Design a protein around this ligand. Structure first.
Ligand SMILES: [Mg+2]
Ligand SMILES: [Zn+2]
Ligand SMILES: [Zn+2]
Lengths: 99, 1160, 50, 118, 49, 119, 90
């Protein structure tokens, strides 16, 4: 199996397929151990955001790829943005203050 | 003059209670109807859980009705229906609220282990707080007569008390009552009076509850939250998209359970509001209020009390909390079955054409439109979709120096993901270098690996300079090489040595390379003879460089040609003069330590190519006649069955103890099993005769099977012994041993009986394999959970103290030395010399300089070395104190990640640990880390004194020992059970043995010393690795022991409050800043405390980190009560938020941003 | 989108109010059809091929 | 058919949190793909399309670029008709349609928008 | 497990100290469980279903 | 006493956390889904001190608690009901008469009737 | 340097700082003012930057300084526009 970019679930903007392509490979805890040990900060960086579940990020970075610019331009993955609202949906309040 | 009011960069996140007005701030409207979607138009209702006016528009830019359509009105709301026409993702972020009539209690702050709302108020949970808010027993709210302030009254008691006084102590019941209770509570005045009363003439009979609540009460008031927010009056609503009802296939919608919940809470709430306007029968309204309570509690967190069912599913409903309580798929990915690729290099891998085509799709597109070919972007897609020849060449361009990193399923350590340079291969399978095939623990049984494409620019450089296989020559666990040649190649180089006498031999001498012409051109053999040739050696010394040394040595044909592969330096010839076994790797290691990376890397490709080729040339096979049985087999078996026969006859005529004759006859067969095993080995080993010149001589068998065993290549004694010898004593499901060992062997036939016996061994073998394989990872998770936050920082501090390293000696009564445990170790300070001078202060023991520690003779067997156990560092680890041991040869690069690499190496060999005064196995490793007291703990002398009995069994009691000397006594308690070891009157030292049994690490650390307890843990945990025979460096054990001793307990008087057990992090940093601040008397002396992996990991600064592993419902709750904030340095919590890792490639980023957050 | 409206205007509109959802053989595989089959709804215009 | 449509309203219906293949662990709502989002490929091409049109109207005259731009309404939101464009350019209706057709005549050799079609 | 009745072992450490504590169990084909077990103090208890 | 002594002395530490043990050694109506989480929370995690927070914290249903208050029967007969109904009509009549006492209620009704005939 | 990259860490310790600086340089090539120092020979900018570090030119301080001169070139040369805007709001 191999996947560049395909569909995503409504609930969590994560790659999935089987209707035309194949849902991309799964990372996980065992692998994020390894990356942290090496010191692959940007690889783990992308592998947690733009490469996976960053709505604007993946589109922004894909355009940068076809333009041959690379870089990244990341953002809060919805797999954490959802948590803010689900926690905020409860009587508890979490706010991400600046400095 | 900043004060920006946008979504910029954040340095921390805060967690606290939300005021009803706090909830109102998020409110983009009020849900008022349980209605979801229309039954006919399938359109969002007015003010339902899915409003368009409240939350967001369905379609992207067109409003609900349709008055406005295109981008003309993206900022203005509709006229007929207040629908802000922006995006549809707005529907994914908008909040919204419901405003209840009577107050409702938050399920979390109510019933979550400690009742927060209760303990804050000092009141029973499921006892009093339940009967008081479920409308059962009314509570008081402060009275100036007869009644106290928080007593519980019945209806009868209520009216009686009301009739006596009344109209001046009014005290309601239910939810709003607890509100007035929490509201009326003065945290300030109570924090004073609680401090006054709970300090007046009370020993340790009160201090418990005293210290606890006063710390808690002080926390909450300072947190900023008002206890009013505990029970909410305004409950906020989750954004619609995060709980949608999307039409599947041909009708049949699919919704989340929250819609069921939110719909119930609204219905119950409105009926409540409607009843608070109609006739209000106390029983009817109160019940509806309890039902709103049920509804809200179920929506927030089911848990817990029955579980609200409905939804037709016999299964419960997924509430909010259950959706955040307890994997990460990714784009640009793929996987396939792996296959060996001998023709590859060490930094290369076979990546399939069609696979790589779809993987670099975004790169191929860009390069196509870049060059020409494709007029536009969509032209490229149609161009690669129609794989048009030219496209493949462009593909050959984009994957040029674009590293792709590989990954296997069970990733135990760092070498699970390694980078390679993509090589196009016409096939649908992924090929891999046969050297790094061992690091992955991968076989070609059908195992399949995954591939990832480093998109980011530096993500490519991270892959090339770190995760690239060529940088991972050595194992992170033990300094030895990891890509060392395995089975096929090693038998290859073993066949390239192995001096055979004569047989097309003779000593016809030449000069290296010319011999190659000799081998191909036949005439001469290859394993002869020996024979002499000219060896041009190269060595260096002092001023390095190279010093030639031509000579005439007696090698073989194999050793001559094989010499060509060897690099410039090295001792030469002598490395080839031996053979191919374990030194095959030894040769590789030494080359790395004396040459460097590149010479070693190319050397590996060469030694790999050599082995395969010559091994293929050799053609060692395994016919049925290769595994020869000894002739004395039937002889030895009869003799053993003769001996056991005599024993059974003795048991028949009494004589010998029949109760344990089972044990002694087992020894007979066990001796018998060894006799056949030795006989088979001595025969199959040497044998042969040859015929040298005048014939008659002996070497060692060229029996293929033997060659494989005498050269690694999966061939051990036990397996061989089963091949031709015999399968010895077999286990019985009971755990006992059968008294009739499998006399036969695999070379011979096997009876149906003895196979049905051996079937048990295999079953319990595979099964036990299945348990310890998952139990291994179960350990690694705990190791990492506690250790994955510390990284080598502040460069290299001062300090000289550190454990005195000495050779692990069981030689006290068994003789077993190991003295390589100091290398790449930084010296403590000039560790003497039988005379003077020698070793420096911070000089790290080189690989060549530890070999210099043999020139100082066997006299010097003790050296103080800086370790992670010590090191007066603060929140990190000194580089010097660590070492160097990596795949890299130097000291660890500043800002590495010691923790994870440490844990990985420790929990990696867990796969090869057998679970069970010797427990032994993986479980033994666990207990040492958990720091658990033994089932029969020994006892130690806290203070050195004179031993005497303290009232023979006068309690209670049970014996009593009292070592008193100099000043003050001690009364230890002996429970009669178990003897003693020191008579009365005798004197003891500070921590002497008076139980001669298992030692408790807690006592050792507490009394003996930190160096002692760490030395105990390391030398005891290693002892279970010796038996399993798995090499693993002591550093990493020390690393986990480091933060295994993270916190301590202060005992005196300081700015820190006594009984509190706090970590030496804040402790040391605060005691250093008090000696020279105002006075050292405003600070106390602390005391190191041993806590296990779990107990240590349980404590951590980030509340986000904790919510990862431990019970989220608890951690998020308690961290909410006090206005806590993560800010924001941990690894784990900085991963889920999805930003740069505060270490490695990052680190620099965090340091800059860490210092940046000093202005305010 | 305006640009697309222009684009079809330059090459011919034919902007059918219909989409596309034809069963296509997934990329990679390839073989020969050995049997087709059609189960029509009870009350639906049966096809020529059906 | 009335009865048929009635059965399309029955049942709650199903909730997403339902286990399906009984993996580790399945949920029906986890298979639900998003369709309101566009493929990054599709988004990239739309941008390149903007560049394509923005560059093709450059090889045109002002009294032809503005004509093509304003008629089919591009880079100006509200699109106008033959009259509202015929009034701002004196000559009404047929004259402006003449130019509008001439611009379309020009785009019969460039391949950019051709392949962008499909 | 076959219907009927059988006396189970439960041998070994079940409350430290180590002392048997035998127990019987009746397993119906279509019905409720009927247990009988001892305790450290040698009392007799029953678990219905 | 009973629960406290039995729980503590037994659990030391029950090794593999023998849950199915002391839960039978507890009073009241069993087989509940409420008392469950209150034992899984204390045993591990915050050991030693958690076991002292438990007893001090130990020193239910909507419908069952509803029938409880409804338990106060106070049922009626044909005599009882009609009595209550008589008091209802009695209360109502006094209200209307009290309303009839109000002249502006008549005059407003008069004013609003002329509004009705004026359509 | 398509096989270590080890010769580069020698010129600047800490393989991590190496990745940061080489990527910095590699970013300079891939987009913007290219101008490599070592001959390309058909190598990606990923490795071209590394070839330079190994060669001995282009380090961390080197890049920062050339950025300083770059700013002094963009700013000081085109100040006639800035000062013109400075008199805008007086
Ligand atoms: Mg395998
Ligand atoms: Zn509208
Ligand atoms: Zn240090």
């Amino acid at each position: 199996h191999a996947r560049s970019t395909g569909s995503y679930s409504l609930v969590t903007q994560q790659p999935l397929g089987g209707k035309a392509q194949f849902g991309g490979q799964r990372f996980g805890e065992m692998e994020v151990w390894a990356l942290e040990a090496y010191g692959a900060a940007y690889t783990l960086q992308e592998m947690l955001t733009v490469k996976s579940d960053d709505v604007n990020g993946r589109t922004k970075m894909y355009k940068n790829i076809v333009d041959g610019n690379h870089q990244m331009e990341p953002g809060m993955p919805e797999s954490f943005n959802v948590l803010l609202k689900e926690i905020r949906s409860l009587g508890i309040n979490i706010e991400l203050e600046d400095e | 003059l900043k004060a920006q009011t946008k979504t910029e960069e954040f340095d921390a996140i805060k967690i606290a209670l939300a005021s009803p007005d706090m909830i109102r701030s998020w409110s983009f409207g009020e849900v008022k109807k349980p209605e979801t979607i229309n039954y006919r138009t399938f359109k969002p209702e007015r003010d339902g859980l899915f409003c368009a006016r409240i939350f967001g528009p369905v379609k992207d830019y067109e409003c609900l009705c349709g008055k406005y359509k295109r981008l003309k009105h993206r900022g203005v709301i509709c006229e007929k229906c207040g629908v802000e026409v922006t995006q549809t993702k707005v529907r994914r972020e908008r909040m919204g609220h419901i405003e209840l009539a009577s107050p409702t209690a938050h399920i979390w702050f109510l019933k979550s282990l400690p009742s927060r709302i209760g303990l804050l108020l000092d009141m029973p949970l499921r006892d009093i707080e339940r009967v008081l808010y479920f409308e059962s027993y009314v509570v008081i709210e402060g009275g100036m007569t007869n009644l106290e302030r928080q007593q519980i009254l019945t209806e009868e008691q209520y009216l009686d008390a009301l009739e006596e006084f009344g109209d001046e102590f009014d005290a309601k019941m239910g939810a709003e009552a607890i509100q007035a209770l929490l509201k009326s509570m003065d945290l300030e005045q109570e924090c004073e009076q609680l401090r006054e009363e709970l300090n007046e003439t009370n020993s340790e009979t009160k201090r418990k509850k005293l210290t606890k609540r006063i710390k808690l009460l002080e926390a909450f008031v300072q947190s900023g939250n008002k206890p009013e927010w505990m029970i909410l009056t305004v409950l906020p609503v989750l954004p619609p998209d995060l709980r949608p009802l999307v039409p599947l296939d041909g009708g049949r919608f699919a919704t989340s359970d929250l819609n069921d919940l939110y719909r119930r809470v609204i219905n119950r709430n409105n009926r409540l509001k409607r009843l608070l306007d109609l006739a209000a029968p106390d029983i009817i309204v109160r019940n509806e209020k309890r039902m709103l309570q049920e509804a809200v509690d179920a929506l927030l967190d089911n848990g817990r009390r029955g579980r609200a069912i409905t939804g037709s599913n016999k299964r419960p409903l997924k509430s909010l909390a259950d959706m955040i309580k307890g994997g990460k798929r990714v784009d640009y990915s793929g996987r396939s079955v792996i296959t060996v690729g001998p023709y590859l290099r060490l930094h290369q891998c076979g990546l399939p054409k069609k696979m790589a085509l779809e993987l670099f799709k975004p790169f191929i597109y860009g390069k196509l439109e870049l060059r020409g070919l494709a007029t536009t972007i969509k032209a490229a897609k149609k161009m690669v979709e129609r794989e048009e020849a030219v496209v493949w060449d462009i593909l050959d361009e984009v994957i040029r120096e674009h590293p792709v990193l590989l990954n296997r399923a069970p990733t135990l350590h760092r070498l699970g993901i390694q980078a390679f340079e993509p090589v196009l291969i016409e096939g649908k399978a992924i090929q891999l270098h046969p050297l790094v095939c061992a690091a992955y623990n991968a076989d070609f049984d059908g195992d399949q690996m995954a591939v990832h494409v480093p998109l980011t620019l530096e993500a490519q450089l991270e892959a090339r300079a770190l995760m690239m296989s060529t940088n991972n020559i050595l194992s992170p666990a033990n300094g030895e090489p990891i890509i060392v040649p395995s089975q096929d190649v090693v038998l290859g180089l073993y066949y390239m040595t192995r001096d055979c006498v004569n047989a097309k031999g003779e000593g016809m001498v030449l000069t290296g390379p010319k011999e190659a012409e000799r081998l191909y051109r036949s005439g001469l053999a290859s394993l002869h003879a020996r024979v002499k040739v000219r060896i041009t050696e190269y060595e260096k010394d002092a001023n390095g460089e190279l010093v030639a040394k031509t000579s005439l040595k007696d090698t073989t044909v194999g050793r001559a040609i094989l010499w060509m592969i060897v690099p410039k330096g090295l001792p030469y010839s002598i490395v080839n003069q031996a053979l191919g076994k374990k030194a095959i790797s030894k040769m590789l290691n030494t080359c790395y330590r004396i040459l460097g990376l590149k010479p070693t890397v190319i050397f590996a490709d060469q030694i790999m190519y050599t082995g395969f080729a010559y091994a293929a040339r050799s053609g060692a096979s395994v016919g049925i006649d290769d595994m020869v049985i000894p002739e004395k087999k039937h002889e030895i078996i009869s003799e053993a069955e003769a001996e056991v026969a005599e024993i059974q006859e003795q048991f028949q005529s009494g004589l010998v103890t029949a109760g344990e004759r089972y044990n002694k006859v087992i020894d007979i067969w066990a001796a018998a099993n060894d006799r056949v095993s030795k006989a088979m080995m001595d025969n199959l080993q040497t044998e042969t005769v040859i015929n040298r010149d005048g014939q008659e001589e002996k070497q060692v068998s060229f029996n293929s099977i033997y060659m494989m065993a005498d050269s690694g290549a999966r061939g051990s004694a036990a397996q061989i012994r089963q091949l031709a010898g015999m399968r010895g004593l077999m286990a019985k499901p009971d755990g006992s041993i059968i008294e009739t060992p499998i006399t036969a062997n695999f070379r011979e036939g096997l009876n149906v009986l003895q196979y049905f016996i051996s079937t048990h061994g295999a079953r319990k073998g595979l099964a036990d394999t299945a348990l310890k394989t998952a139990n291994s990872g179960y350990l690694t998770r705990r190791l990492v959970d506690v250790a994955q936050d510390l990284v080598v920082t502040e460069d290299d501090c001062g300090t000289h103290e550190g454990i005195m390293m000495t050779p692990v000696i069981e030689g006290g009564d068994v003789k077993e030395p190991l003295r390589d445990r100091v290398l790449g170790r930084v010296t403590a300070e000039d560790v003497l010399k039988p005379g003077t001078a020698d070793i420096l202060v911070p000089r790290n023991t080189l690989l060549h300089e530890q070999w210099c520690d043999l020139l100082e003779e066997n006299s010097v067997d003790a050296v103080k070395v800086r370790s992670v156990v010590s090191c007066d560092t603060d929140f990190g680890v000194c580089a010097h104190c660590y070492g160097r041991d990596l795949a890299r040869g130097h000291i660890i690069n500043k800002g590495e990640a010691i923790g994870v690499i440490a844990a990985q190496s420790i929990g990696e060999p867990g796969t090869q640990l057998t679970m069970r005064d010797i427990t032994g196995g993986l479980p033994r490793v666990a207990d040492l880390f958990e720091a658990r007291r033994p089932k029969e703990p020994a006892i130690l002398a806290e203070i050195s004194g004179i031993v005497s009995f303290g009232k023979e069994t006068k309690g209670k009691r049970r014996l009593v020992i009292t070592p008193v000397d100099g000043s003050d006594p001690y009364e230890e308690m002996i429970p009669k059970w178990r003897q003693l070891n020191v008579f009365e009157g005798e004197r003891v030292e500070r921590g002497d043995v008076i139980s001669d049994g298992p030692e408790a690490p807690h006592d050792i650390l507490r009394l003996r010393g930190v160096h002692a307890v760490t030395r105990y843990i390391v030398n005891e945990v290693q002892d279970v690795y010796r038996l399993q025979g798995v090499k693993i460096n002591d550093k990493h054990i020390e690393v986990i022991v480091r933060q295994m001793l993270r916190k301590a307990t202060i005992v005196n008087a300081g700015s820190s409050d006594f009984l509190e057990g706090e970590q030496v992090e804040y402790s040391r940093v605060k005691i250093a800043n008090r000696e020279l601040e105002a006075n050292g008397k405003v600070g106390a002396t602390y005391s190191r405390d041993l806590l296990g992996i779990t107990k240590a990991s349980l404590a951590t600064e980030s509340f986000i980190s904790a919510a990862s592993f431990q019970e989220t419902t608890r951690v998020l709750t308690e961290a909410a009560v006090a206005g806590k904030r993560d800010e924001l340095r941990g690894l784990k919590e900085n991963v889920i938020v999805g930003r740069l890792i505060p270490a490695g490639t990052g680190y620099a980023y965090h340091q800059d941003r860490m210092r940046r957050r000093a202005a305010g | 989108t305006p640009e697309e409206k222009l684009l079809r205007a330059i090459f011919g509109e034919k902007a059918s109010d219909v989409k596309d959802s034809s069963l296509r053989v997934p990329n990679g595989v390839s073989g020969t059809v050995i049997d087709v089959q059609v189960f029509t709804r009870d009350g639906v215009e049966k096809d020529k091929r059906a | 058919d009335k009865i048929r449509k009635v059965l399309k309203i029955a049942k709650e219906p199903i909730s997403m949190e339902t286990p399906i293949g009984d993996d580790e662990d399945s949920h029906l709502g986890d298979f639900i793909e998003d369709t309101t989002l566009e493929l990054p490929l599709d988004s990239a091409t739309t941008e390149s399309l903007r560049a394509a049109t923005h560059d093709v109207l450059a090889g045109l005259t002002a009294r032809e670029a503005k004509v093509l731009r304003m008629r089919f309404g591009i880079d100006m939101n509200t699109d106008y008709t033959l009259e509202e464009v015929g009034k701002q350019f004196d000559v009404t209706r047929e004259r402006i349609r003449q130019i509008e057709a001439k611009a379309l005549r020009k785009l019969r050799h460039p391949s950019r928008s051709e392949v962008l079609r499909s | 497990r076959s219907p009927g009745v059988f006396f189970d072992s439960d041998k070994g450490k079940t409350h430290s100290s180590g002392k048997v504590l035998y127990n019987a169990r009746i397993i119906p084909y279509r019905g409720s469980w009927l247990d009988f077990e001892f305790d450290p103090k040698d009392n007799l208890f029953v678990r219905i279903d | 006493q009973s629960q406290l002594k039995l729980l503590v002395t037994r659990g030391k530490e029950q090794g593999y956390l023998t849950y199915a043990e002391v839960n039978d050694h507890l009073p009241e109506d069993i087989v509940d889904s409420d008392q469950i989480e209150d034992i899984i929370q204390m045993i591990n995690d915050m050991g030693i001190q958690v076991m002292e927070e438990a007893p001090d914290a130990d020193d239910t249903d909507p419908v069952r608690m509803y029938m409880r208050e409804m338990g106060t029967v106070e049922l009626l007969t044909r005599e009882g009901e009609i009595d209550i109904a008589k008091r209802i009509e009695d209360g109502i009549n006094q209200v209307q008469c009290s309303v009839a006492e109000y002249p502006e209620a008549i005059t407003y009704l008069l004013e609003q009737y002329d509004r009705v005939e004026a359509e | 340097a398509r096989v270590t990259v080890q010769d580069a860490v020698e010129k600047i310790g800490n393989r991590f700082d190496l990745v940061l600086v080489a990527a910095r340089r590699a970013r300079q090539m891939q987009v913007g003012g290219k101008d490599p120092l070592v001959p390309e020979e058909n190598d990606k900018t990923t490795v071209i930057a590394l070839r330079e570090i190994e060669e001995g030119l282009i380090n961390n301080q080197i890049l920062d300084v050339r950025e300083r001169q770059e700013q002094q070139e963009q700013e000081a040369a085109e100040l006639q526009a800035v000062t013109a805007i400075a008199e805008g709001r007086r």
